[PDB]
Amino acid sequence: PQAFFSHNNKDKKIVLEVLEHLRQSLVATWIDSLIQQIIAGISKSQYFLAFLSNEYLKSDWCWDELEQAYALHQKGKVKIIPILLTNRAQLDLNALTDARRNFLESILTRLKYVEFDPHNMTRSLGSVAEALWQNEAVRFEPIRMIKVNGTELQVVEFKIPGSNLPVDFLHHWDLKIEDFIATSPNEQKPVKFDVPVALYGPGPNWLYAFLTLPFKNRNTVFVFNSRTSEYICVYSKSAGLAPGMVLKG
Amino acid sequence: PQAFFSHNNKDKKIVLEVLEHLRQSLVATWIDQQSIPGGGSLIQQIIAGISKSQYFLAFLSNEYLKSDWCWDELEQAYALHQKGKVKIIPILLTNRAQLDLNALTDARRNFLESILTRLKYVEFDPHNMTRSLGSVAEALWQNEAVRFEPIRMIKVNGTELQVVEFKIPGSNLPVDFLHHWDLKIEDFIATSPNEQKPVKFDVPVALYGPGPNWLYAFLTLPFKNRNTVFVFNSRTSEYICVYSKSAGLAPGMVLKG
Amino acid sequence: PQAFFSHNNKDKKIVLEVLEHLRQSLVATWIDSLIQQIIAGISKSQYFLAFLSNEYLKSDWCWDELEQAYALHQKGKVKIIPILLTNRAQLDLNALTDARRNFLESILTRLKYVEFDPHNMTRSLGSVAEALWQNEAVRFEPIRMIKVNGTELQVVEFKIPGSNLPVDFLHHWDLKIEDFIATSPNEQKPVKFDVPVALYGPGPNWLYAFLTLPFKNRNTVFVFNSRTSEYICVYSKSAGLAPGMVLKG
Amino acid sequence: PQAFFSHNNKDKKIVLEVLEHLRQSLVATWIDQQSIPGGGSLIQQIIAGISKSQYFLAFLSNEYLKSDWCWDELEQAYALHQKGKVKIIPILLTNRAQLDLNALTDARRNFLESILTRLKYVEFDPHNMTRSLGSVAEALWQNEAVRFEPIRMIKVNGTELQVVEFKIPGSNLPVDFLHHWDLKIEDFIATSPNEQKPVKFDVPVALYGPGPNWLYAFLTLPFKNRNTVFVFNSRTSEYICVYSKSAGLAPGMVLKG
RNA sequence: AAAA
RNA sequence: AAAA
Ligand SMILES: Nc1ncnc2c1ncn2[C@@H]1O[C@H](COP(=O)(O)OP(=O)(O)OC[C@H]2O[C@H](O)[C@H](O)[C@@H]2O)[C@@H](O)[C@H]1O
Ligand SMILES: Nc1ncnc2c1ncn2[C@@H]1O[C@H](COP(=O)(O)OP(=O)(O)OC[C@H]2O[C@H](O)[C@H](O)[C@@H]2O)[C@@H](O)[C@H]1O
């Protein structure tokens, strides 16, 4: 899915870090307009990431977009999820006018919010990830680099919410893995360039085919077979690895 | 699995037909001046690839027993089969009773009798084409891993599709099966509509048949930018598409079959 | 994609630097009028690079050209993107008249802008380039000099926005590389004279043919194949190199 | 790859035809007093170029099976083929049954038998021109890298064009393959319309067939300032133009195929 | 055939 | 044949 970030320049340090963590989870992140950019793709367009902070709400030009974003979210095109840089209690709610205060209280009452803090980085990042992926289909755990049996490999982990998906779910999915592959070693991307990529997690075989197929001539693809709980190679794009090698997981 | 053909031109009419049937079943076929740029002919063509090299096709016929040009070939083929490099499977063009055994010498007759007794054979008859073809295909696939039924040109829900059917003998395979397999599917797709090949050019291909996920991935992977790939899912029993290489075909729709 | 710079003589030092950096990215750049060559070429003419500066806004004989540029820009023949020498806050807007100030606010708000600073040169230049290539087809990263396996070489890096292009895209492209090859060692051009040039980056083979073909009898052409990740030489216009030699990654 | 033709004038009618067909397939065809500005006859031409020198096309025939002279060169070709510099592809103008073996001496007969059994040969018949021509083309291309089918002149969407087919045996080539290739396109480009050559002058040329991008670039690059170049992309199966050397043809248009 |  |  897509995810746009709305923020102030003061919290850029946190914004870039959360952006990097999200991009590590195979979600399209665009920062730099954003409101006319909303009407694009399918009804499953994206989710709005609003980063609420004390110096942030003092700017009206940081607020008109969110006002009209609520206006266009009531029609169901997009959904907003607010991020509290500071806790609810110490938010400067006095400075704003009456209408601003009521709209903010409505947005933090009728709409579920999650809180972010710098001290608990791991917990805050996990909470924003889960509260961001609560209303969506199969997840995508962040890429982890693990060296198995002397062979370097990066593994993408996905978990199915529930036990089944609609048979035509692939039609309405808006994620394609082609643009999430690094082209150069120096370039930063969710998937390391030329580094073997493995598939992990239970799921229907057609989703496995859809994930593995676009990787031709880009990276060698490993896949997990739970019958014996080991990795299996299907593509030989790097010398020294043949299709059929097994990695003791 | 490769297959080297030994025959005579008097049987070319049936050799071409059996070759076409085998090629429609995802099997590498090799006839006269064919491929393997090595020594060539056939006898030195045996020694290439993995221990699962091929299954010899000795098209025995009443007139085949002449022309020592082929009997020496069969002799060397069995000699190197005794080492286990290749396994011979004979095809009897005519029924066993009316083979002109008297024409052969004593040594040739003894060799042929030993071959036809120790080693199983397949009877072939022009009259019953489909049963003989099924018999020879099943005999070829008998001592092998997951089979491959002939590609079938079927029309589903208004869109044209070809399916590749594979059945697993038993219900499990060694986890390192893919290492020793001698089938590379990317060479069996035609580049032009008129060119004859196991897979029609640009026609969507669907994988059907129960099996492990890694086999499915290895089979759908080399098809990228060649043919739109459909996949059969047994949970609700309709084909599932994972490529958009042809106009009007998007990844995700269903074909109720 | 051509690029027309309208600016003042005061910031000419940074104008020339941004010009050189842009030219290094295979972007056609013209400086020395600017209003009437706008009608030339194809519908994709260029994007106007109007240099917004505090000294610039006091020059009405440089305001008029921007006015006519925007007047034509309603029709969509050209589009203007502004570069901010100073931060948006410290502009001298009060001395401006009512109509000109309103026009400046309209263009600054309804149209996205980008901010430049003399200190952080690298990130500012990267942002300028990204703003240039936002709405365009396949990108073009700046040419870099790398000696691979003891052989001098420059790589032309191009990135596909997304994973597919229109099949008839080549018809409407406004880039031919024949004008971007140096004819003399002294003459400064994006492609240095007689040195090997390589094409690196994923893309369809027809684009590779189009980008390699005009190079005949000009420079030895290298190419990168990602199957095993080494460069491949296809043309030998210089001694010591043969078609078929490899450069290890 | 090169091809040297050894024959007799009694078979010139078919020799010129097969040579023309071969030249249509982008292979170097050398005949008497025709090429090699650094030698003469046919024998010492072998010591030239790379280890992939050429394949000897010995046009065996009943009238050829004598012409004493021919033998000396046939013997030398075989003797230096034992070193592996050249290969011999014998062409039987007549079937081997009516080959007058009795006229030859014991040494010549023994040598002919040895070369006929140990080395693969191709039968040629006047009646089946297409099949025999395809067979000899396959004989040429069997022990080589990516092969070239004959150039076909086809009009697509009302636009004149020719296509150079090329198919890669197997699925991959050595990365350094381009170093050892003996095929350069420049030598096969016509200079005048009346001049006969594999590539017609100024006629648009289309590259079609699956292969690596570097091979595509190498095959298209020498075409600058000579002919308009078309490239086939399999994403939508349409021809794409990359050069505008003829009026009315801009780089970027598509040809529905 | 929903990690067989 | 969209870095095979
Ligand atoms: N396809 C055929 N073409 C020509 N003659 C044939 C063919 N099939 C059978 N015969 C005849 O039947 C006998 C076949 O033996 P022979 O071919 O002489 O010699 P070998 O056993 O060492 O095979 C040489 C190979 O090289 C070539 O590629 C051939 O096609 C072979 O595959 C002779 O009477 C043939 O004329
Ligand atoms: N290409 C040929 N053209 C004409 N006659 C030929 C040819 N090939 C064989 N013969 C006949 O084969 C017999 C033996 O002479 P030959 O094998 O020719 O000699 P060589 O290999 O030292 O080349 C000389 C050729 O080169 C010149 O270009 C001419 O064409 C010469 O023929 C004669 O009856 C020839 O007529």
Contacts of C112 in chain A (CB under 8 A): 33
Amino acid making up residue B68 = D
- For residue B24, which of B162, B212, B169 has the smallest C-alpha distance? B162
B117 at the D interface (CB within 8 A)?
Answer: no
DSSP, collapsed to helix, strand or coil, labels residue B10 as helix
Task: State the span(s) of chain A assigned CATH 3.40.50.10140.
Answer: 2-132
D9: DSSP letter: G
Residues with CB under 6 A from ligand 2: D 8-9, 32-33, 41, 67, 69-70, 73
D173 touches strand F (CB under 7 A): yes
Identify the bridge partners of residue D161 per DSSP, sorted by sequence position: D154
What is the residue with the minimal CA distance to atom 28 of ligand 2? D32
CA distance A23 to B196: 46
Block residue for tokens 């009898």: C217
> Across the interface, which of C169, C170, C244 has its CB nearest the CB of D176?
C244
Contacts of A129 (CB under 8 A, 6+ apart): A21, A22, A25
Q: For domain A2-132, which CATH number applies: 2.20.28.90, 3.40.50.10140, 3.90.1150.10, 3.40.50.970? A: 3.40.50.10140
DSSP 8-state assignment for residue D50: S
Separation in Å, CA of C27 to nearest CA in chain D: 20
The position carrying tokens 């676009």 is A214
For residues D166 and D27, the answer to whether their CB atoms sit within 8 Å is: no
Strand F closer than 7 Å to the CB of D232?
A: yes
- Could you tell me where the beta strands, DSSP code E, fall in chain A? 2-6, 28-30, 46-52, 79-84, 114-115, 141-148, 151-157, 197-200, 221-225, 230-233, 246-248
User: From CA D156, how far away is CA D153, in angstroms rounded?
Assistant: 10
- CA distances D49 to A23, C245, D73, D180, Å, are 55, 18, 20, 10
Give span(s): CATH 3.40.50.10140, chain B: 2-142
Kindly state the greatest CA–CA separation across chain C. 68
Report the CATH superfamily, name and number, of domain D2-141: Toll/interleukin-1 receptor homology (TIR) domain (3.40.50.10140)
Residues 6+ positions from C118 with CB-CB distance below 8 Å: C14
The technique is cryo-EM
| DSSP structure class, residue A181 | B
Residue A66, judged by CB atoms within 10 A of its CB (0-12, 13-18, 19+), counts as: buried
DSSP A214: G
Instruction: Name the residue among B200, B189, B188, B218 with its Cα closest to residue B162.
Output: B200
Residue A146 near chain B (CB below 8 Å): no
User: Taking Cα atoms as reference points, which of C117, C109, C12 lies closest to residue C56?
Assistant: C12
Mutate to test the interface with A, among C229, C231, C248 (most CBs of A within 10 A): C229
Inspect the interface and report whether the beta carbons of A167 and B236 lie closer than 8 Å.
Answer: yes
Backbone angles phi, psi at A233, to 5 degrees: -90, 140
> Both tokens of residue D129?
């021109």
Cβ–Cβ of B217/A230 closer than 8 Å? no
Rounded CA-CA distance A52/A83 in Å is: 5
User: For residue D151, what is the DSSP state?
Assistant: P
DSSP string covering B62-107: TTTTS-HHHHHHHHHHHHHHTTTS-EEEEEESS-GGG---TTS-HH
C209 beta carbon < 7 A from strand F?
no
Query: Can you tell me which residue has its alpha carbon closest to the C1' of nucleotide E1?
Result: B210
Measure D8 CA to ligand 2 centroid, in angstroms.
7
The helix-helix angle for D213-220 and C205-212 (nearest 10°) equals 40
- Please state, in angstroms and rounded to a whole number, the distance separating the CA atoms of residues B173 and A243: 15
Class of the CATH domain delimited by B2-142: alpha beta
The residue to mutate among D35, D69, D71, D75, having the most atoms of ligand 2 within 8 angstroms of its beta carbon, is D69
What is the residue-wise DSSP string for C195-223?
S-EEEES---HHHHHHHHGGGTTTS-EEE
Q: Do residues A48 and A31 make contact, with C-beta atoms less than 8 angstroms apart? A: no
- Give the whole-angstrom CA distance, residue C223 versus residue C246: 10
Query: By 3-state DSSP, what share of chain C in percent is helix, strand and coil, each rounded to 5?
Result: 30, 20, 45
Which of strand E's nucleotides are less than 7 A from any protein C-beta?
Answer: 1-4
Q: Is C185 helix (H, G, I), strand (E, B) or coil?
A: coil
Token reading at B33: 């001046």
Amino acid at A62: C
Resolution reading in Å: 4.0
CB C85 within 8 A of CB C52: yes
Shortest CA distance to C191 belongs to which of C130, C241, C145? C145
Q: Residues with Cβ < 8 Å from A148, sequence gap 6 or more? A: A231, A247, A248, A249
Q: What are phi and psi of C19, to 5 degrees?
A: -65, -45
Among A33, A37, A183, A191, most C C-beta atoms within 10 A, so best to mutate, is: A183
Separation of CA D20 and ligand 2 centre (Å): 20
> For the packed helices B106-118 and B68-81, what is the interaxial angle rounded to 10 degrees?
50
Report residues whose beta carbon is within 6 angstroms of any ligand 1 atom. Answer: B 8-9, 32-33, 41, 67, 69, 73; D 96, 117, 120, 123
Q: Which residue in this structure is represented by tokens 């684009």?
A: C207
Calculate ∠ Cα A219-A225-A226, nearest 5°. Answer: 145
Tokens (6 digits) for C140 = 């073009």
Query: Which own/partner pairs from A236-244 qualify as long-range (CB within 8 Å, at least 24 positions apart)?
Result: A237/C227, A237/C228, A238/A194, A238/A196, A238/C228, A239/C228, A241/A151, A241/A196, A242/B179, A243/B178, A243/B179, A243/B218, A244/B176, A244/B177, A244/B178, A244/B179, A244/B180, A244/B181
- Residue C165 near residue C138 (C-beta atoms within 8 A): yes
Q: Of the candidates C246, C185, C176, C248, which has an alpha carbon nearest to the alpha carbon of residue C219? A: C185
